[PDB]
């Protein structure tokens, strides 16, 4: 009786409409992928043979549950299969499946049970098959998922005062540290915005280094925002931008707000794309920064192809595409930087985004590019000389590769889904400490559920443990009963047989 831990599919609700699987109780047999009834039976598929047509057939057959045995290494898997699992994910996720779906990890006993289930499912012959019918029944633990109603989505915010004056423009940079995949407990999210927020930390360090010294204390208020509630329609940004605009009258989100950068999945890859909701106006700070960025990317580092992406704001999509969209909604200059090119790509989320998928060299180079562009635009350097054919960050300010790698490793160390990173988890605590060492006015915004037309209601029971109980049908046991009955008849004869044998001697 194996006792493994099965991670369910997402069960979040947004704006009142549900999403993902909506069930967390199963007690059925384990009938893997076969031409049998497959109804009211747990279906076992392996990632190596998990076809979408098969999955849609499974869903149409109203299975009791679906369990996927992810490969244990999850890195030695061929990259093409990885691409297929990337391509299957957005379509798989966007549904209201009412049947629990659990994802497991390869195990010796798990492989054995999968093999046995495959043998029994696929397959004198009828009675022999009934006699050797070792088909296990899988049951889960706990109760159905309940809407966790008192989850405070966190958000870490820090400021950076300019040099002198109360009207300094306040550039704001955000990155949602969280990342949800098709499995919240498996959503490490390394190449996703967990890799843009990492660059933000180095920028935080670097800009702290830049602001710490008087001679480099630029006159530009900087509001950094390690937002929570990211791929979840950017709720953390929604609530934060709301609280600093309509609730209060203070805060820099009203003073002289310049362009608001947002960083996500800006890691691996040789192409950089700056997505915009609306084209930058020529002459403004956004346009000036874009010119600096193009000059740098054309002069400093020619190895990356760069191109703006101008996606018009769409108020029909489930999510607000990039993150700068929520900022541009509140008449605030913003744009998102990413190594990706299309928002429609299911390259985000991506539980497949293991740590080994974000190259450290690309991260250092991307950080160099962005930070140097920001430095040039902030310090009025463009109208100061400084040709873009030579960098700022050579020594004494070099982007710490070790720091970037270690931070990324730590980030990937644990799942970063918004429903599992508590508002006081050690992950958040370590992040806040790291940010506190570099920023000013660091705090933690929280969004509960709005308690009216719930913007989001996370559910629980995501890391359930499932039992593989051995069992055989009653027909086998009836056959065993017939065998023992024959033996008992023999026993009835044996008494007189032994009496006669003793008499004979």
């Amino acid at each position: 009786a194996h006792e493994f831990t099965v991670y369910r599919m997402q069960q979040y609700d947004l704006q009142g409409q549900p999403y993902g699987t909506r069930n967390a109780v199963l007690n059925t047999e384990a009938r893997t992928m076969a031409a049998e009834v497959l109804s009211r039976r747990c279906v076992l598929m392996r990632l190596l043979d998990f076809s979408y047509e098969q999955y849609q057939k499974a869903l149409r057959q109203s299975a009791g549950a679906v369990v996927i045995i992810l490969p244990r290494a999850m890195a030695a898997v061929p990259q093409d299969v990885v691409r297929q699992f990337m391509e299957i994910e957005p379509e798989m996720l966007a549904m209201e499946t009412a049947v629990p779906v659990y994802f497991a990890v390869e195990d010796e006993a798990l492989l054995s049970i999968y093999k046995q289930t495959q043998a029994a499912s696929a397959s004198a012959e009828v009675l022999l098959r009934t006699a050797t019918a070792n088909g296990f029944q899988m049951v889960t633990s706990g109760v159905q998922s309940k809407a966790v109603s008192d989850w405070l989505i966190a958000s870490v915010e820090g400021r950076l005062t300019g040099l002198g004056g109360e009207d300094l423009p306040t550039i704001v940079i955000v990155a949602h540290y969280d990342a949800f995949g098709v499995a919240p407990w498996l959503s490490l999210g390394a190449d996703s915005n967990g890799s843009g927020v990492s660059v933000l930390l180095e920028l935080a360090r670097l800009f702290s280094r830049l602001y710490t010294y008087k001679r480099t204390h630029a006159a530009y208020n900087l509001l950094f925002f390690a937002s929570g509630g990211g791929k979840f329609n950017y709720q953390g940004t929604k609530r934060w931008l709301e609280d600093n605009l309509d609730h209060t009258d203070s805060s820099l989100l009203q003073d002289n707000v310049a362009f608001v950068l947002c960083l996500d999945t800006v890691g691996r890859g040789s192409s950089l794309h700056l997505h915009v909701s609306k084209p930058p106006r020529e002459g403004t700070l956004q346009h000036a920064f874009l010119r600096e960025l193009e000059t740098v990317a054309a002069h400093q580092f020619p190895e990356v192809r760069f191109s703006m992406v101008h996606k018009r704001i769409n108020l029909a999509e489930d999510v607000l595409a990039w993150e700068h969209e929520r900022f541009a909604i509140r008449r605030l200059p913003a744009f998102t930087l990413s190594h990706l090119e299309s928002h429609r790509d299911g390259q985000r989320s991506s539980i497949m985004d293991v740590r080994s998928r974000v190259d450290s060299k690309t991260l250092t180079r991307n950080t160099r590019i962005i930070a140097e562009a920001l430095t040039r635009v902030i310090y009025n350097l463009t109208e100061k000389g400084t040709p873009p054919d030579m960098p700022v960050f050579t020594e004494q300010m070099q982007i710490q590769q070790e720091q970037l790698d270690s931070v990324m490793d730590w980030l990937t160390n644990q799942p970063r889904a918004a429903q599992l990173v508590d508002k006081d988890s050690t992950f958040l605590s370590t992040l806040e400490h790291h940010l506190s060492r570099y920023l000013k006015d660091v705090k933690q915004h929280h969004v509960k559920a709005d308690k009216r037309d719930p913007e989001f209601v996370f559910y629980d029971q995501l890391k359930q443990v499932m039992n593989a109980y051995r069992v055989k049908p009653a027909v086998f046991d009836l056959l065993l009963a017939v065998g023992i009955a024959a033996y008992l008849g023999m026993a009835y004869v044996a008494v007189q047989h032994f009496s006669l044998l003793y008499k004979t001697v």
């Binding site: 280094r209 020594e395 004494q396 300010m397 070099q398 710490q400 070790e402 720091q403 270690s406 931070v407 490793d409 730590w410 160390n413 988890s425 050690t426 605590s429 370590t430 806040e432 400490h433 790291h434 060492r437």
Partner: protein
Amino acid sequence: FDLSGNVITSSEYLPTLWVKLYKSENLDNPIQTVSLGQSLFFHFPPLLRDGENYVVLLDSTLPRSQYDYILPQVSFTAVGYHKHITLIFNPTR
């Protein structure tokens, strides 16, 4: 020097840890005892960079009587400009 450096360990072991800055010349007189507390990141106040071999002995409060562990030790002779010591702490028993 602006020292830094994360720590790789389980969450529950974090409050019972204090990273050290044992100077190389004397390993019995620590010069910094930043407690990790609840954050997997120590940010030792900036030091000067001139040789100065140091130690980062991870001095936990957890005794061997109920758990088995080995405290890491890192030397980072101060000649550079930053550091991201990445102590990995996985006690047993």
